[PDB]
Design a binder for this molecule. Sequence first.
Ligand SMILES: [Zn+2]
Lengths: 208, 80, 281, 167, 298, 136
Amino acid sequence: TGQNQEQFLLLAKSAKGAALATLIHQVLEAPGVYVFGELLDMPNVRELAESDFASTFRLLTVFAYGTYADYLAEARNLPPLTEAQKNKLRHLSVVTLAAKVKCIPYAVLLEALALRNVRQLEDLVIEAVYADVLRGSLDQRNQRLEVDYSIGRDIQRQDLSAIARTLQEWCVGCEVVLSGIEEQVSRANQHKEQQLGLKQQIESEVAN
Amino acid sequence: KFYESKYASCLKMLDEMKDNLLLDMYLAPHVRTLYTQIRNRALIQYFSPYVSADMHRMAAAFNTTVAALEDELTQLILEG
Amino acid sequence: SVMACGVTGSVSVALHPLVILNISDHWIRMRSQEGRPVQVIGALIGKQEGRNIEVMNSFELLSHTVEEKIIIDKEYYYTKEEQFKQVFKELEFLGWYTTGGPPDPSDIHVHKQVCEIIESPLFLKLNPMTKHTDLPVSVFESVIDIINGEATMLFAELTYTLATEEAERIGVDHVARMTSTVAEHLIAQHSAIKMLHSRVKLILEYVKASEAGEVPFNHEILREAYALCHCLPVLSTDKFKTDFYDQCNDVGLMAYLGTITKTCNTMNQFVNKFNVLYDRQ
Amino acid sequence: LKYLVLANMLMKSGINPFDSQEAKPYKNDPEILAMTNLVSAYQNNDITEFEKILKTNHSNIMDDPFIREHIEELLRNIRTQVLIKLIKPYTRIHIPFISKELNIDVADVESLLVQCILDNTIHGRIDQVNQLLELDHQKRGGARYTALDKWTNQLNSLNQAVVSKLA
Amino acid sequence: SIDEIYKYDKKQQQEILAAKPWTKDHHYFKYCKISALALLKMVMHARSGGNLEVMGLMLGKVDGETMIIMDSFALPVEGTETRVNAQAAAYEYMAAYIENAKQVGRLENAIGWYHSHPGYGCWLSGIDVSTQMLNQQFQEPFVAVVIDPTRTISAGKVNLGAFRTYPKGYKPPDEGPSEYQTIPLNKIEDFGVHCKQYYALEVSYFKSSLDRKLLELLWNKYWVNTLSSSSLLTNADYTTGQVFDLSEKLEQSEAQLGRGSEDKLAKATRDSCKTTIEAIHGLMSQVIKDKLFNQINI
Amino acid sequence: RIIRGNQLQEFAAMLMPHQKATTADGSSILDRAVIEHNLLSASKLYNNITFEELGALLEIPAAKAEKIASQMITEGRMNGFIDQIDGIVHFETREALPTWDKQIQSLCFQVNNLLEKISQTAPEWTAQAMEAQMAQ
Ligand SMILES: [Zn+2]
């Protein structure tokens, strides 16, 4: 998303209670809008929390942080969604699965998205790749989804540290590899010169 | 019949000749070698185009029993 | 700022660094000859595989100015084409290049002339007087739009990647470096890793600055950093493990046979000398 | 002219009898038109068309014994090439499928495949138990392992010859 | 001044061509300066030929004992390495190319010829020596450049040589170190026959101030390509071809020990060493990639 | 992208009668072109697929999916191979180590895009943290 961010933020700053409550149902039922981080952090939408339209804010929280199974567990409280919105939330659940692991079996996908047959799932993954949400390829025989690239959904202000926790884990990793080379290169010289020196001793005994 | 992969009728006619060719002056002292060389070659030519072959059809095509074919094939794998 | 500034098009341009050096050399040579910076113009050649365009080589084009407008010599181009087709038979005219800042009316006028030669030409612009820290190369496609009833041509910028040719990488690296078998072979990797480590550290520091506070919070950038974190480890599948250890055992076996050959030679030297000193042949 | 077209097809493959010299205006003749249809069908390798012309022009071809004697050989010559065009995209192909596609008995399909693999026209093998044709496809970097194999053999003989020097 | 070398002085070149100092000394030309553009273009052309030899012409100039190559271009010729003076078939094309180049401000004229030796090292064969001797007899000042694109890739270092022939009858002086290269058995005989009929120039490279700037800025993104090289499988068939040769060399070195050219086993040992060392370096890059991108986890 | 029957139904309704030309048994040039387009498009989504499923996704019988896939492979318009016993078409995977190198490229390109976006949105901290690299 990018154009829709500005286009709906313009309307978000110029909207009130009920108009915002219906705007939430309009942003979730719109193609391309898979991130709601700027929209959920608005004071105008913060007013809707713990108010007359609380379930809509909870629905936006599920769409920005939770999965389709989390929606199914709280479907009695949350407002009803159409097939397009249910699909979108399923796409985002596949993104969460893809964020966890690279190779996703069909069983875990069928259980997490609440699907009955394989083609439904395959068609949803196609709809994902076609909406530029996921990249990858499907394997029928081994019944597995090979994920090449998945987008970012969750913002997580409190759990942000975890990102750094992995980034540092990569940094340290680099810092090992780098030093490794520095040492190995040094060794590669340490041998060479030594050997040359040794040869120069052998060659000095030819005169005797 | 050897070239057309019809080894049943080929061995049938060959065994029909056997006793009559056994009476020939110069041909007889080789009649064991030739026949064994032919049969073996045939067995190879029969199994050449197969990855997985039924031994009953093979035994029927070579005018022999399945256990005798099993022994013959075991000898053919061991050296041939 | 008269150009497209809207929807993307093909968005698959792979540029070879040879082309960048061709254009740099063209500009340096004309500047050397005239003693002042000169706008240079030329042709881009390469391959098109569906929506993927690969820009592989380039050559200088002949032009004249009529009053104030730039006219491309088309006869020269068709002659040059007859000449490059003999040695680069699989390559095709893909577009044109020139030097300077952001696209202008003159570039559009010339682009239309190039459009008389090929249907959808690329336009590459190189800024040899850049003030900025990023590579001063941009690539554009042309779009034909209607603004207030006037059907006009505009440029839309395309993103591009650099080519992945191994010989070219080594050549470019060797040129950029311009100075034991191990010590000199892992230095380009050490510099590449150092560059990666810098990028990783800058992104990590941006994350901590955002989370600690003071520095402005951004949903979109930290979201991409989250998306980057989830891309690690790259390839953890069992097929890849089997293939990686296949590679490693192949090189391992080869190293074992090589060491055997060297030890066979050392044994030969020793026995040759032992049969002379300790033995009488 | 009929025996000329028969010889043009049996030669494997003349495919241009009425494009030569004297046979050019005679192709329109209603008696030898059957052979023009048959030589065009043999040229494009079509069994269905060949058998259709052989069924339509039954008495014009099958009454003569010299053409009837070699018509089976010719038919098999077409069937071989159509099978080769059919096996190309498959790695494992059913025998009953080929039997229904070429329109020929399953035993004659296996007999044709046996003869064809024996003459190296079809690259593959037959799985007689599961009744399928397992075609030859599995090719990887086998050039390296052969070079490493000869390197191993030569290093063996060399190290033996180096140790042979001392006593 | 980094860009001083790019200045073309026509009268100065005419003066040098009228003076002909190379006639006073057969070792006159000692250095070969190659532009980054010409290097890249010749290596790119050489790689584009694959396992087949290609050739082209080099445009440039002379400066004292130094031959300067500014640019190059491919010639549409057959029989590189089999035909003496194969370039001759492109005469017409060369005349037109240069004419058209002059129209766009390429002022430098023919300074030499380049060709590739895919997977068999940089040196001059018998055919190459005849070709270069012709060129030095009728087209002087002229230099021969040879590139091995395959070994460039496998060694991770540019494999290029610049050579000049000696006139018929003339003997080289005492000093000749000769930097060692593995030559395959199908080429070694011809190599040995003609190796003393020419000498190697000291090669160096140069780039402009703008090239310098652009290559630093290119590197700011081109580093990604160094950590995704995959060199072990790009030209695998080369190392397997070399091993084949190595095996036959070892067969000959075994025949030498049999009963009873100067120590074939030591040569073969240095060949096997070089091939293996290249292979292990490939694995080093692969393991480095595995350490950086795979061993991270959640 | 894979074109659905429904989407083609609407497009076919947009056409003139002359534009609905049919080659043989009632099947139109467009019908067949869309199947072939969809087969090639499906080859970009899957490493392998069954004829039953492929038929269902393309809204054609499984035998037709096999037959047309087989034709396209033989004609050189699609890269793949067919397993008739298991009833599966395998598409040109291009996996193993080259994919690993390409995924590394994607990751590092993501790194570069992220650094460029950090410098664009907040250059102050970018310079402030850039000096720290030189300080070490
Ligand atoms: Zn040569």
